Amino acid sequence: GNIFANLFKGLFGKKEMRILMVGLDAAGKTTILYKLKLGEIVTTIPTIGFNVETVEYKNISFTVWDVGGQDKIRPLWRHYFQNTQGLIFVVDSNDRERVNEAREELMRMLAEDELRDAVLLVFANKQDLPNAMNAAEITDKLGLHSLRHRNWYIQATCATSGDGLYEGLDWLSNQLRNQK
Amino acid sequence: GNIFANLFKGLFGKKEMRILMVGLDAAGKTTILYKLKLGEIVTTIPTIGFNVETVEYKNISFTVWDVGGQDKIRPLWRHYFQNTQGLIFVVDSNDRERVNEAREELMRMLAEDELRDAVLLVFANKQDLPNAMNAAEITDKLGLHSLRHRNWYIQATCATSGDGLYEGLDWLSNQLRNQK
Ligand SMILES: Nc1nc2c(ncn2[C@@H]2O[C@H](COP(=O)(O)OP(=O)(O)O)[C@@H](O)[C@H]2O)c(=O)[nH]1
Ligand SMILES: Nc1nc2c(ncn2[C@@H]2O[C@H](COP(=O)(O)OP(=O)(O)O)[C@@H](O)[C@H]2O)c(=O)[nH]1
Ligand SMILES: [Mg+2]
Ligand SMILES: [Mg+2]
Numbered sequence: 001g002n003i004f005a006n007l008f009k010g011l012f013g014k015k016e017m018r019i020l021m022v023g024l025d026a027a028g029k030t031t032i033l034y035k036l037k038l039g040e041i042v043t044t045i046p047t048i049g050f051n052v053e054t055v056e057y058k059n060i061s062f063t064v065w066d067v068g069g070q071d072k073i074r075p076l077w078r079h080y081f082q083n084t085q086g087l088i089f090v091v092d093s094n095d096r097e098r099v100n101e102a103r104e105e106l107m108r109m110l111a112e113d114e115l116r117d118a119v120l121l122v123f124a125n126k127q128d129l130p131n132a133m134n135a136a137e138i139t140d141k142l143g144l145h146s147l148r149h150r151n152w153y154i155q156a157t158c159a160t161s162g163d164g165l166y167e168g169l170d171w172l173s174n175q176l177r178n179q180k
Numbered sequence: 181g182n183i184f185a186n187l188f189k190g191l192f193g194k195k196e197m198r199i200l201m202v203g204l205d206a207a208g209k210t211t212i213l214y215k216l217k218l219g220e221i222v223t224t225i226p227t228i229g230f231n232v233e234t235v236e237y238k239n240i241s242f243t244v245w246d247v248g249g250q251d252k253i254r255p256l257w258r259h260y261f262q263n264t265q266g267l268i269f270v271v272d273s274n275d276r277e278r279v280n281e282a283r284e285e286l287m288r289m290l291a292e293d294e295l296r297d298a299v300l301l302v303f304a305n306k307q308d309l310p311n312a313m314n315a316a317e318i319t320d321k322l323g324l325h326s327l328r329h330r331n332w333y334i335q336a337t338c339a340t341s342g343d344g345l346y347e348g349l350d351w352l353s354n355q356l357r358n359q360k
Contacts, residue, residue, distance in 0.1 A: 030231060051210060
């Protein structure tokens with residue numbers, strides 16, 4: 001997680017940004033945070049049934065929560081979407097079953113108005129698993145090629161080995177830097 | 181935090197103790213930990229698949245992980261078992277289908293020679309739901325009475341109102357101070 005500090009120690013212009021990482025639960029999001037080695041994973045429960053994990057590195061901060069079948073139900077999600085310039089959606093590639101439901105939660109967030117210019121990175125995760133759908137059918141199943149007017153990218157990962165996180169985050173780091 | 185800080189005040193100095201707090205998933209452990217207000221909830225993952233939440237209050241550390249995994253007492257658990265003085269088991273009182281499974285996981289834990297000297301506090305959590313089993317039924321379905329040569333106490337709680345937490349920890353904090 002030093003090669004990971006080298007991507008984000010350039011954005012470090014102190015305006016205070018947020019990268020969102022979300023997905024159905026058991027996708028691999030906490031594992032991916034832990035591998036980046038950018039700081040402590042610290043949990044808060046802003047309201048009941050809303051567990052938020054956050055690694056803060058410099059002015060930058062990753063923010064993770066599960067989606068799918070929305071808690072008690074509350075989105076102060078929107079006070080989170082504010083300063084969001086990157087959105088990562090982690091998907092369990094092995095899970096052909098709830099695959100169409102991640103589609104839904106993906107589409108619900110993109111339909112969100114404060115995430116109009118946020119860049120999208122999809123991690124098709126659990127690639128080491130034998131049934132794991134390849135990136136090509138994750139894209140198919142997520143309807144990603146129907147996204148006109150959004151800057152997006154799908155990256156095959158295995159968060160336990162760490163395979164794919166640099167490359168996906170390298171890209172993501174590009175777009176944020178390259179614009180504003 | 182404040183009130184809860186002062187219970188854990190005579191256990192201080194050099195001793196470097198651990199209170200384990202385990203139980204099935206969705207029992208209410210991160211919720212309880214967040215209520216304590218003793219420090220930030222830091223997650224680590226010391227090995228594949230094994231998330232562990234920790235709140236250090238000085239020399240007192242609260243360690244959390246879910247039990248019931250599919251099947252397993254890990255070599256790594258038993259290293260945690262070494263400086264565990266107290267052990268909190270948290271039961272979703274409304275979860276009637278998995279309480280027996282709650283029983284074996286706890287029966288499994290107490291069979292560990294590293295834990296033989298540990299004070300057991302069962303929080304019978306989620307006592308605000310209509311269908312919740314009360315402390316009397318729980319004591320039953322876990323069989324707290326068959327327990328010889330162990331110091332135990334069962335305390336009905338509501339993690340989200342924070343109700344019940346003080347008295348179970350009042351008691352536990354004494355068992356580690358005045359006895360022990
Ligand atoms: N085979 C395989 N398992 C993974 C991978 N990433 C995460 N896992 C496992 O998936 C489970 C859920 O991970 P976790 O980070 O806690 O999930 P989340 O926060 O619910 O999405 C844990 O058992 C992880 O070890 C992966 O790429 N490959
Ligand atoms: N109704 C009710 N639910 C609770 C209570 N305490 C915890 N929960 C909920 O049960 C779910 C799991 O809580 P959590 O702290 O994350 O679980 P654990 O860490 O997996 O043991 C969440 O929706 C919590 O809000 C309670 O006392 N009453
Ligand atoms: Mg998580
Ligand atoms: Mg938890």
